[PDB]
């Protein structure tokens, strides 16, 4: 955001999901993440050539980024990479990896069941990329022979070679984050090495894996296994750096240093005097930290808890709903130009009005563009200042730079220019979204005409009590101020209280006369009830439209 | 159409797709006692010709996938002897319009 | 493709303007008016860009066109000038 | 007939509480649970297991698992679901977003 | 070489220009941006043909801002040099390292070493020259060059050429 | 204040698409990123002022676009990449309905 | 990079690595300069290449018509050719366009055939050859005397034409040559 | 409910589709009308004795005591015996009979009060007020004016526009019930004897029914999915329940709604109703 860029501005028309190839991870990388350390080497408290590191983005408000030289706000951050000492399963694909293993010969890489098998032919025909893989799996899982030859479609007596070796297939089971096979006096039991799984996957034909759920360009099964790990830049794992002599690294920064630590342990162990049953130990550890980094809340396994004993935020857990990125940061957001206070009803507001306390009106602003129509009014609001009620808070120049009327030494001699925006106070009759949560209705959010009033409560007409499901038992409501001439039009023309009167929920109106007015209307409209002139004249005057005819 | 009492052995069942283009239907006598199509809730399903279906998709700018489906094993689908892809025009009475027509493609 | 554009003759969407098309025309025009675009109607002392836009719509002097997309991706273009505004 | 009975049963829940809901609403829910020939539940493994947008479906109940499968099967989100445009911060093809607005230079020059 | 290409630029106009001199403004902003431009993809966009019939099409109004985006379809004369392309040009500069040759909008540079042995530099000549037993190459001489390779730069395409092969050199 | 999922629903119900966008973007976390036109990631090293844009390991300095998305979405995407998932954003359609 | 220019060729380039090939006179021009082009009317149209003589007359004509449109909206021979084009440029061009002034001076100084009549007859002559647009352009742009002079400078040719056939063309081209 | 219906919207082709463009409803709520523009109205031809229906709707210009009295319209005296005209009223009535039997097929219980789109009672009311209809002097309407005027109005009640037999038959269906009500309320005897409409008044009732009807159709862009979801959901939140504190005691309200949406196989109160 914020600075000008010559790059063409378009909209995302498609999202192509896929898997990272290790090759991509390296190409796309700005730093080879080498050390678990974050800085303070040579003495200097400033990011190290290993973790975090300038190559990735800024820790400080430096202006430096090394990569783009743009600075914190503008810089999105750039990915680094860690070359892993041994391949590791991506925790989220362990079951799929097992199912791919169950479908293919764990030796020659051929898909265990050919287009020679009739049931397989039907399964292959399935157009659904996933339902096909389901049908393929159910058929191949119970195939424990990689056939050399098979009965021909013409005659089943004279068998035809379909290709592939003649190896027995293992009965695969999941034991933690490992896969163990059982071939066939007594069965042979051994763990399947991540390398071995990967090698077999690399040997699966394009035609074979595109017959499984996979994609030649975007998700080759071999990419479910990780060799080159991308390192998310600092904006994903912000170092909340308080004071000078202190920092505050993110959970992810620790888990990554753990991955790094475990990796060096493994790489130095295998390179040097490898006891080979201490190598498998460090490899299990690297598999644990790479698994537990993406998902920490793994089925029937211990949690990878912090120093504190605090479980550690998995990237998974970050996105997992109600408060995830998706449910809490994207489908929902806390928003600017919003207000909230206790509501209390008013018989002297119109149905479509909303009483806004002066303090609230004085905080919330509308960005009005200086034009020949308002130039005169707008200069008065700017003159009035951010403290008087009909006033303004900021003046935005052509330059895009904001003038703070509270402090500007030129706040009194501002001479507006067409094009500038005056961020003025919300004034009477501005359309605003008014809302009582839970928002179960179209009507739980309606557009109202502002009425700036004294006292600290939002005032509403009593007949609009029903659609909101509001009481004055101490209920609070939200106000949202639109900022575009366009979004106001949306509120006024589509969701304003009068429009919302006859609801499509029940093909009947969702507002009517209530409480005092309902009780009193029966009372007034009785045969027995009569009114003397004195009061008739007041009761007439009170009707604002009244034609002036007694 | 073979109307069987209790069962048709799987050894006999092998013979059903054995003689194409001709299609064979297996119906249990017990299911046929009541004509389900006669039920209060069962509307009228009308089998559409190749041309009739082509026109449907043309006129609503539809891909077969977009059409609401009917399972090949659906009681009414079986009754009309619906094959895969065959589209059925369902005419039900409506409390909103008087009569409403939906279409269901076979599976 | 440009088999996408449905021709003026043989067009079948409502010859009327939708509540949404009105809300977006008024908004769009008020936004344009608000950011100093030339106004095609004589403002008879008018100053609110929405009130000016409404006057523009009322005199059918809005030079916008609605591109109505069909589910297949095809479209019928309808001018603000030609659409009936019952609402 | 399943659809008919399903409507009846949904309606009878609403009608019993006295309250009235216009036919079309209950009809639409019932129609949705039925278009794909058979009874599609309004649950995690019902509607959320459709061929709809990977981003759209992750927005309800099986989020990360959904997105993992998106990568593994190289899914392509069309971006026509409200949800995707909400995630992308784009004007959704909803109501006011169902069409496009264009300036006609011809009519512009005709008005001036 | 020197092509005629069918190209299209997307211009975004601010609401203030939604007046009648719009197609007028657009067609000009097209020439502002595109004319005299230089890409690697198309080379030098030299002159926009058929100003009178430039296709503005309908302009889509961008949603949160009032501006309208037009895809202005046009057709122009372009210059794209290539390796193996034989060019006729005129000397522009000349030093101890070689001489530059102005070929249309771009310069082709001949190396001391991409010239025949017999042709050798002379510092003491006004302006400096390259002297062979028969011909002399200086600041204004016409040369036929064979483009050995091209380098794409911001708003230019520079190239290296040879006058070593037969039928290449002074003209 | 919160413009939560439920408030999103109501705006959709109203068909107020522009208001919803404003609420989610301009009134909250709207952000500008540079996308690669080839590989569709936020890889672009945009030194905007020198006017340089590059997707090294694509060698792309031509097919580059700018997009406005919620920062939370920019984040979500980097988070998915951190977990080896490629959420490739493309500015043009490839299928057609 | 910037809001650059699009083409009428549709790029299908999804993820696939930059497999872009060599540019030579093995007539391996760009993808952007393929023989089978597509004009703005969606029709397949053959590549357009210009001999300096054509190229000058095109830019001249274009700028001349532009002056006409500019004077309409306003309402409501060798060195003396160079002199005059510099004046047309002062009017129809942005002046910031140094490239076109440089181009016009080059074409005005290197054009083999001056008047349209001859540039048409040259076009009609090389038309028949059925050679690549680029080769037909070079045969107009580069003056050759030997079939070998031509076949050397335009290697692309080689076996495409007879030595004597090309020499008949090169002769006709010298005859059509304007005496500046 | 919301997350299951989000992407359902009405398209510019009057169809109801999701983000896949799969058809859900061929036209919103089988009638193609915006729920807000609907009101409970009585379909008169459905109920009562056939004798009472006959008295209400039958006109027989060939029967001295079953014609329209000249007190009803000017033409009255000269309309008696008009064979060609009796062919119009005969067809008019044959259709009113058709409607009655059809309605009885749709609403089996003989329920007449159904929410439909144009408040015809109010139009006639307003017309009478507007024109100060004198329920004394004879109308200036002709049999053809009424008979063919109503016939012509029907053709202009457009929900679907499309120059093809599929889209056109779709249109005929969508207006099948409304027309039933229309034919019911604007029958020759009703128009002349009940409402005492003049040609002016009648022509106005027609132009208004047309206008009001067109106004009543759903707007493409209508986010009809979320609408439906919320319209079922919000009433659920207002449920006391379960099924009193005691016919059959079937599980109801929130627990039965949960049971339904889950498509629960093992349900609390399974039961048949054998007739
Ligand atoms: Mg309370
Ligand atoms: Zn950076
Ligand atoms: Zn094998
Ligand atoms: Zn890239």
UniProtKB/Swiss-Prot annotation, chain B:
Subcellular location: Nucleus
UniProt similarity note: Belongs to the archaeal Rpo5/eukaryotic RPB5 RNA polymerase subunit family.
Oligomeric and partner information: Component of the RNA polymerase I (Pol I), RNA polymerase II (Pol II) and RNA polymerase III (Pol III) complexes. Component of the RNA polymerase I (Pol I) complex consisting of 14 subunits: RPA135, RPA190, RPC40, RPA14, RPB5, RPO26, RPA43, RPB8, RPA12, RPB10, RPC19, RPC10, RPA49 and RPA34. The complex is composed of a horseshoe-shaped core containing ten subunits (RPA135, RPA190, RPB5, RPO26, RPB8, RPB10, RPC10, RPA12, RPC19 and RPC40) where RPA135 and RPA190 form the DNA-binding cleft.
The protein's role, per its UniProt record: DNA-dependent RNA polymerases catalyze the transcription of DNA into RNA using the four ribonucleoside triphosphates as substrates. Common component of RNA polymerases I, II and III which synthesize ribosomal RNA precursors, mRNA precursors and many functional non-coding RNAs, and small RNAs, such as 5S rRNA and tRNAs, respectively. Pol II is the central component of the basal RNA polymerase II transcription machinery. RNA polymerase complexes are composed of mobile elements that move relative to each other.
Name of the protein this chain belongs to: DNA-directed RNA polymerases I, II, and III subunit RPABC1
Native species: Saccharomyces cerevisiae (strain ATCC 204508 / S288c) (Baker's yeast)
The encoding gene: RPB5
Section covered of the full-length record: 109 to 215 of 215
UniProtKB/Swiss-Prot annotation, chain C:
Sequence segments annotated as region (Leucine-zipper): 43-64
More info: Present with 6090 molecules/cell in log phase SD medium.
Compartment(s) where it occurs, according to its Swiss-Prot or TrEMBL record: Cytoplasm; Nucleus
Name recorded for this polypeptide: DNA-directed RNA polymerases I, II, and III subunit RPABC2
GO MF: DNA binding; DNA-directed RNA polymerase activity
Function: DNA-dependent RNA polymerases catalyze the transcription of DNA into RNA using the four ribonucleoside triphosphates as substrates. Common component of RNA polymerases I, II and III which synthesize ribosomal RNA precursors, mRNA precursors and many functional non-coding RNAs, and small RNAs, such as 5S rRNA and tRNAs, respectively. Pol II is the central component of the basal RNA polymerase II transcription machinery. RNA polymerases are composed of mobile elements that move relative to each other.
Family membership: Belongs to the archaeal Rpo6/eukaryotic RPB6 RNA polymerase subunit family.
One GO cellular component term noted in the UniProt record for this chain: cytoplasm
Keyword Nucleus set for record: yes
Keyword match Nucleus: yes
Assigned keywords, A-Z: Cytoplasm, DNA-directed RNA polymerase, Nucleus, Phosphoprotein, Ribosome biogenesis, Transcription
BP GO annotations: nucleolar large rRNA transcription by RNA polymerase I; ribosome biogenesis; RNA-templated transcription; termination of RNA polymerase I transcription; termination of RNA polymerase III transcription; transcription by RNA polymerase I; transcription by RNA polymerase II; transcription by RNA polymerase III
Gene that this sequence comes from: RPO26
Coiled-coil residues: none
Swiss-Prot record, chain G:
Keywords associated with the record: Acetylation, Cytoplasm, DNA-directed RNA polymerase, mRNA processing, Nucleus, Phosphoprotein, Transcription
Gene3D superfamilies linked: 1.20.1250.40
Location within or outside the cell: Nucleus; Cytoplasm; Cytoplasm, P-body
GO BP annotations, alphabetical order: DNA-templated transcription initiation; mRNA processing; nuclear-transcribed mRNA catabolic process, deadenylation-dependent decay; positive regulation of translational initiation; RNA-templated transcription; transcription by RNA polymerase II; transcription elongation by RNA polymerase II; transcription initiation at RNA polymerase II promoter
Main location as per UniProt: nucleus
Record flagged with keyword Iron-sulfur: no
GO molecular function terms attached to this record: nucleotide binding; translation initiation factor binding
Region of interest: Disordered: 1-23
GO cellular component: cytoplasm; nucleus; P-body; RNA polymerase II, core complex; RPB4-RPB7 complex
SMART domains: RPOL4c
Family: Belongs to the eukaryotic RPB4 RNA polymerase subunit family.
Subunit text: Component of the RNA polymerase II (Pol II) complex consisting of 12 subunits. RPB4 and RPB7 form a dissociable subcomplex associated with the 10-subunit Pol II core complex. In exponentially proliferating cells, only approximately 20 % of the Pol II complexes contain the RPB4-RPB7 subcomplex. In starving cells, that enter stationary phase, RPB4-RPB7 is associated with Pol II in a stoechiometric manner. The RPB4-RPB7 subcomplex probably associates with TFG1. Interacts with LSM2 and PAT1.
Gene label: RPB4
UniProtKB/Swiss-Prot annotation, chain H:
Record note on quaternary structure: Component of the RNA polymerase II (Pol II) complex consisting of 12 subunits. Interacts with DEF1; the interaction is direct and serves to bridge RPB1 to the Elongin complex in a DNA-damaged dependent manner. Interacts with the Elongin subunit ELA1. Interacts with the Elongin subunit ELC1. Interacts with ASK10. Interacts with ESS1. Interacts with RTT103. Interacts with SHE2.
Coiled-coil intervals, chain numbering: none
Taxon lineage: Eukaryota, Fungi, Dikarya, Ascomycota, Saccharomycotina
Residue spans crossing the bilayer: none
Name recorded for this polypeptide: DNA-directed RNA polymerase II subunit RPB1
Modification after translation: The tandem 7 residues repeats in the C-terminal domain (CTD) can be highly phosphorylated. The phosphorylation activates Pol II. Phosphorylation occurs mainly at residues 'Ser-2' and 'Ser-5' of the heptapeptide repeat. The phosphorylated form of Pol II appears to carry, on average, one phosphate per repeat. The phosphorylation state is believed to result from the balanced action of site-specific CTD kinases and phosphatases, and a 'CTD code' that specifies the position of Pol II within the transcription cycle has been proposed.
Subcellular localization, as worded in the UniProt entry: Nucleus
UniProt comment concerning the protein's domains: The C-terminal domain (CTD) serves as a platform for assembly of factors that regulate transcription initiation, elongation, termination and mRNA processing.
Span of the entire protein shown here: 841 to 1119 of 1733
Family: Belongs to the RNA polymerase beta' chain family.
């Amino acid at each position: 955001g914020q600075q000008y860029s010559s790059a063409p501005l378009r909209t995302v028309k498609e999202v192509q999901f896929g898997l990272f190839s290790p090759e991509e991870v390296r190409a796309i990388s700005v730093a080879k993440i080498r050390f678990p350390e974050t800085m303070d080497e040579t003495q200097t408290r400033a990011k190290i050539g290993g973790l975090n590191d300038p190559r990735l983005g800024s820790i400080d408000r430096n202006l430096k980024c090394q990569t783009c030289q743009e600075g914190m706000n503008e810089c999105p951050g750039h990915f680094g990479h860690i070359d892993l000492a041994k391949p590791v399963f991506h925790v989220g694909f362990i079951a799929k990896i097992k199912k791919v293993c169950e479908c293919v010969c764990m030796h020659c890489g051929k898909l265990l069941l050919d287009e020679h098998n009739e049931l397989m032919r039907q399964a292959l025909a399935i157009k659904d990329s996933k339902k096909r893989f389901a049908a393929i799996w159910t058929l191949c899982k119970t195939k424990m022979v990689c056939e050399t030859d098979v009965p021909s479609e013409d005659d089943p007596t004279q068998l035809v070679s379909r290709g592939g070796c003649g190896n027995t297939q293992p009965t695969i089971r999941k034991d933690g984050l490992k896969l163990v096979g059982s071939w066939k006096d007594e069965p042979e039991l051994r763990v399947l090495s991540t390398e071995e799984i990967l090698n077999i996957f690399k040997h699966i034909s394009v035609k074979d894996f595109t017959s499984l759920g996979f994609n030649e360009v975007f998700s080759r099964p071999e990419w479910m296994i990780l060799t080159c790990l991308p390192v998310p830049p600092p904006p994903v794992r912000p170092s909340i750096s308080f004071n000078e002599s202190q920092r505050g690294e993110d959970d992810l920064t620790f888990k990554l240093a753990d991955i790094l630590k475990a990796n060096i342990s493994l790489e130095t162990l295998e390179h040097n005097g490898a006891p080979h049953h201490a190598i498998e130990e460090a490899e299990s550890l690297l598999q644990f930290h790479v698994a537990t980094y993406m998902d920490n809340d793994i089925a029937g396994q211990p949690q990878a808890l912090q120093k504190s004993g605090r479980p550690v935020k998995s990237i998974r857990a970050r996105l997992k709903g109600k408060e995830g990125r998706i449910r809490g940061n994207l489908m929902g957001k806390r928003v600017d130009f919003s207000a909230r206070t206790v509501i209390s009803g008013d018989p002297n507001l119109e149905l479509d009005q909303v009483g806004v306390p002066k303090s609230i009106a004085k905080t919330l602003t509308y960005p009005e563009v200086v034009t020949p129509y308002n130039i005169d009014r707008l200069t008065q609001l700017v003159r009035n200042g951010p403290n008087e009620h009909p006033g303004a808070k900021y003046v935005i120049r052509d330059s895009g730079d904001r003038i703070d009327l509270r402090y500007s030494k030129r706040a009194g001699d501002i001479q507006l220019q067409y094009g500038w925006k005056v961020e003025r106070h919300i004034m009477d009759n501005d359309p605003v979204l008014f809302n009582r949560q839970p928002s179960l209705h179209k009507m739980s959010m309606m557009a109202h005409r502002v009425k700036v009033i004294p006292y600290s409560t939002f005032r509403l007409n009593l007949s609009v009590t029903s659609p909101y499901n509001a009481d004055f038992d101490g209920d609070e409501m939200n106000l949202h101020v639109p900022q575009s001439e366009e979004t106001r039009a949306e509120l006024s023309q589509l969701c304003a209280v009068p429009l919302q009167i006859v609801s499509p929920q029940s093909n009947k109106p969702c507002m009517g006369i209530v409480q005092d007015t309902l009780c009193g209307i029966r009372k007034l409209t009785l045969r027995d009830t009569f009114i003397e002139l004195d009061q008739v004249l007041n009761m007439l005057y009170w009707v604002p439209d009244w034609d002036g005819v007694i | 159409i073979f109307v069987y009492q209790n069962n048709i052995t799987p050894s006999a069942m092998k013979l059903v797709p054995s003689i194409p283009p001709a299609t064979i239907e297996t119906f249990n006598e017990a299911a046929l006692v009541v004509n389900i199509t006669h039920h209060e809730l069962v509307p009228k399903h009308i089998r559409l010709s190749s041309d009739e279906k082509r026109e449907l998709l043309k006129r609503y700018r539809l891909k077969e996938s977009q059409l609401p489906r009917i399972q090949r094993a659906d009681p009414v689908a079986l009754y009309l002897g619906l094959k895969r892809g065959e589209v059925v025009k369902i005419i039900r009475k409506s409390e909103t319009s008087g009569r409403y027509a939906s279409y269901r493609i076979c599976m | 493709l440009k088999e996408k554009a449905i021709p003026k003759d043989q067009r079948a969407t409502t010859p009327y303007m939708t509540k949404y098309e009105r809300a977006r025309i008024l908004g769009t025009r008020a936004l344009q008016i608000s950011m100093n675009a030339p106004v095609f109607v004589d403002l008879e002392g008018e100053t609110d860009p929405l009130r000016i836009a409404m006057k523009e719509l009322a005199e059918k002097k809005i030079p916008l066109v609605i591109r109505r997309y069909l589910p297949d991706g095809s479209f019928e273009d309808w001018s603000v000038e030609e659409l009936i505004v019952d609402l | 007939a399943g659809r008919a009975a399903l409507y009846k049963e949904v309606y009878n829940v609403i009608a019993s509480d006295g309250s009235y809901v216009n036919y079309r609403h209950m009809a639409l829910l019932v129609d949705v649970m039925t278009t794909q020939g058979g009874l599609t539940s309004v649950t995690r493994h019902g509607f959320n297991r459709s061929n709809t947008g990977a981003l759209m479906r992750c927005s309800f109940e099986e989020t990360v698992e959904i997105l993992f499968e998106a990568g593994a099967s190289a899914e392509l989100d069309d971006c026509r679901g409200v949800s995707e445009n909400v995630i992308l911060g784009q004007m959704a093809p909803i109501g006011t977003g169902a069409f496009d607005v264009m300036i006609d230079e011809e009519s512009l020059v005709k008005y001036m | 070489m020197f092509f005629i290409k069918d190209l299209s630029l997307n211009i975004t106009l601010h609401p203030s220009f939604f007046g009648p001199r719009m197609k007028q403004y657009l067609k000009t902003k097209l020439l502002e941006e595109v004319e005299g431009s230089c890409t690697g993809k198309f080379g030098y966009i030299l002159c926009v043909l058929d100003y009178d019939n430039i296709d503005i099409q309908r302009g889509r109004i961008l949603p949160t801002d009032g501006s309208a985006e037009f895809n202005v379809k046009y057709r122009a004369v372009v210059f794209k040099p290539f390796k193996g392309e034989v060019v006729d040009g005129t000397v522009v500069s000349c030093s101890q390292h070689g001489f530059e040759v102005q070929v249309g909008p771009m310069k082709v540079f001949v190396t001391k070493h991409l010239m025949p042995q017999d042709l050798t530099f002379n510092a003491g000549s006004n302006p400096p020259s390259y002297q062979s037993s028969e011909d002399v190459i200086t600041i204004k001489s016409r040369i036929r060059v064979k483009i050995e390779g091209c380098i794409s730069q911001v708003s230019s395409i520079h190239a290296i050429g040879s006058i070593k092969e037969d039928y290449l050199g002074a003209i | 204040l919160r413009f939560g999922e439920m408030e999103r629903d109501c705006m959709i119900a109203h068909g107020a698409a522009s208001f919803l966008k404003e609420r989610l973007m301009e009134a909250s976390d709207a952000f500008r990123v540079h996308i690669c036109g080839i590989c569709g990631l936020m890889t672009v090293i945009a030194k905007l002022n020198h006017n340089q844009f590059e997707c090294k390991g694509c060698d792309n300095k031509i097919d580059i676009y700018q997009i406005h998305i919620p920062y939370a979405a920019k984040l979500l995407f980097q988070e998915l990449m951190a977990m080896n998932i490629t959420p490739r954003l493309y500015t043009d359609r490839s299928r057609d309905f | 990079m910037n809001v650059s220019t699009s083409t009428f060729q549709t790029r299908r380039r999804r993820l696939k690595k930059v497999e872009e090939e060599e540019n030579a006179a093995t007539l391996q021009l760009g993808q952007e300069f393929q023989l089978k082009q597509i004009n703005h009317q969606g029709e397949e149209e053959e590549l357009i290449a210009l001999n300096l003589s054509e190229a000058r007359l095109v830019i001249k004509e274009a700028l001349v018509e532009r002056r006409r449109a500019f004077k309409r909206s306003q309402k409501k021979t060798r060195e003396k050719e160079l002199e005059s084009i510099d004046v047309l440029l002062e009017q129809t061009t942005g002046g910031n366009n140094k490239d076109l002034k440089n181009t016009m001076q080059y074409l005005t100084n290197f054009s083999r055939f001056r008047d349209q009549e001859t540039v048409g007859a040259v076009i009609q002559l090389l038309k028949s050859t059925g050679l690549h647009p680029f080769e037909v352009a070079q045969l107009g742009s580069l003056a050759c005397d030997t079939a070998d002079e031509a076949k050397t400078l335009i290697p692309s040719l080689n076996n495409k034409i007879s030595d004597d056939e090309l020499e008949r063309i090169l002769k006709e081209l010298s005859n059509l040559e304007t005496l500046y | 409910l919301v997350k299951a219906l989000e992407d359902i919207m009405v398209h510019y082709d009057n169809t109801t589709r999701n983000s896949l463009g799969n058809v859900i409803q061929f036209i919103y709520g089988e009638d193609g009308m915006d729920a807000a523009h609907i009101e409970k109205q009585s379909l008169d031809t459905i109920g009562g004795s056939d004798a009472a229906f006959e008295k209400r709707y039958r006109v027989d210009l060939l029967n001295t005591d079953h014609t329209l009295d000249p007190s009803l319209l000017e033409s009255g005296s000269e309309i008696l015996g008009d064979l060609k005209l009796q062919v119009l009223l005969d067809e008019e009535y044959k259709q009113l009979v058709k409607d009655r039997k059809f309605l009885r097929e749709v609403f089996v219980d003989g329920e007449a009060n159904w929410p439909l789109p144009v408040n015809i009672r109010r139009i006639i009311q307003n017309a009478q007020q507007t024109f100060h209809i004198d329920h004394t002097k004879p109308s200036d309407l002709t049999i053809k004016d009424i008979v063919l005027g109503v016939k012509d109005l029907q053709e202009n009640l457009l929900v679907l526009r499309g120059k093809n037999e599929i889209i056109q038959n779709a249109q005929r269906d969508a207006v099948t019930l409304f027309c039933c009500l229309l034919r019911s309320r604007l029958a020759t005897r009703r128009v002349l004897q009940e409402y005492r409409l003049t040609k002016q008044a009648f022509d106005w009732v027609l132009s208004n029914i047309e206008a009001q009807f067109l106004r009543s159709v759903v707007h493409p862009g209508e986010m009809v999915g979320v609408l439906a979801a919320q319209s079922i959901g919000e009433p659920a939140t207002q449920m006391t329940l379960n099924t009193f504190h005691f016919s059959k005691k079937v599980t109801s309200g929130v627990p039965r709604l949960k049971e339904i949406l889950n498509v629960a196989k093992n349900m609390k109160t399974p039961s048949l109703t054998v007739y």
